[model samples]
Target: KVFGRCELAAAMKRHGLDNYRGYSLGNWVCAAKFESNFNTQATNRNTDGSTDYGILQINSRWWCNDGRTPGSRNLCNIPCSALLSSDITASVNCAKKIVSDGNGMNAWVAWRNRCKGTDVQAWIRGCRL
Candidate 1:
């Protein structure tokens, strides 16, 4: 099923600018597509135990007691402090918070550029709220 603009907007608003005004749906979805093919149920494996999950790849293990599970309403709840917190702002904010401390999209882009390199431009062109 196609995702709603409001849904993406909410997600972006939740995590986009970190208390700022400008929010880019393209950037958010780009991150999502580049990271997990827009799979809100997505998760990753880390030897250290911490990993990313959800639409924005929220790392719940680090922020919440819940690990990563698909379609987990509790985990999807925003503003819960975890990366996947249901609160739109909290979820996006959490990602922005962590991203602020690290490489700008290097980690995310690497995977997309590698696995789906040819699809990047097309993906971005079609990416919109």
Candidate 2:
């Protein structure tokens, strides 16, 4: 499901993502915009033959099982399809764990390539949440 910017912000706020691990809501939202544009079902095949899954684009190389991936560690212990849902509860949890594992937002190349050092507030600009 593709959510509007406000809806995505609201959902992230509801999930305690605004202050999650000291990361701002704008950080998460900005990364999401670059990663998947708030589409829960978004999928992208990378040049290295790994596929990214869901709103945060969790990669099959480490986080989840995409079935066809040969060496997925499945650290999140979730089916790749599970992340591709409107609920997003599991996705958020997995992301939290990913952060806790020390990658933080750096776990996402989108964050590194786009959100980092950028004015992330524009991601939530007009969202009342």
Candidate 3:
């Protein structure tokens, strides 16, 4: 939120975001821009118990926790508050894992298309199959 794109880029790089499929340091930044408006500390709430807390808008509950506040645990641990935490690298890395899980980048591309009609999405769509 208070950091520049370069600063955010540094944070993302430290988290190994470039290793993600269909994602580069630049594209990951774009995703973050869309997901959290580049606010590393941004969070959203899910009411249906389906999608709760988030960093990159993760439904912290599903991949992490569903009881006692999902994403309310810690890095790599199940059940943590991925929203109220200040571990940028740790948090982004964790989100990267989920984003990399099931043809992860492909899913990212789909979301990118639906989420952003800008040039960023075009770049993402053109990068892979």
Q: Among these predicted structures, which one has the highest TM-score?
A: 2
Judge candidate 1 against the unseen true structure and give its global Cα lDDT, from 0 to 1. 0.49
Of the candidates shown, which would achieve the greatest lDDT relative to the real structure? 2
Better of 2 and 3 by TM-score: 2
The model with the greater TM-score, 1 or 3, is 3
> Taking the tens digit of each residue's C-alpha lDDT, what string does model 3 give over 35-113?
6666656656557554434446665544556465534543356544555465675557567667756656444432466
Cα lDDT listed for each candidate: 0.49, 0.90, 0.56
Model 1 regions lying over 4 Å from their true place: 1-25, 60-87, 107-129
Q: Sort by lDDT, best first: what order?
A: 2, 3, 1
With a 3 Å backbone cut-off (N, CA, C), the pairs that clash in candidate 2 are: none
CA RMSD (A), model 1 = 7.0
Stretches of candidate 3 off by over 4 Å are 66-76, 106-111, 114-118, 121-129
lDDT of 3: 0.56
Clashing residue pairs found in predicted model 3:
71-80, 71-81, 71-82, 72-80, 72-81, 73-79, 73-80, 73-81
- Relative to the true structure, candidate 3 has a C-alpha RMSD (angstroms) of 5.8
Looking at model 2, report the run of 10 residues with the lowest lDDT sum. Answer: 96-105
Q: CA shift at 13, candidate 1, in angstroms?
A: 6.0
Model 2, range 1-129, lDDT digits (tens) per residue?
999999999998999889888888999999888999889999999987889989999889888999988977999999999999899998898898898887678989989998998888889999999
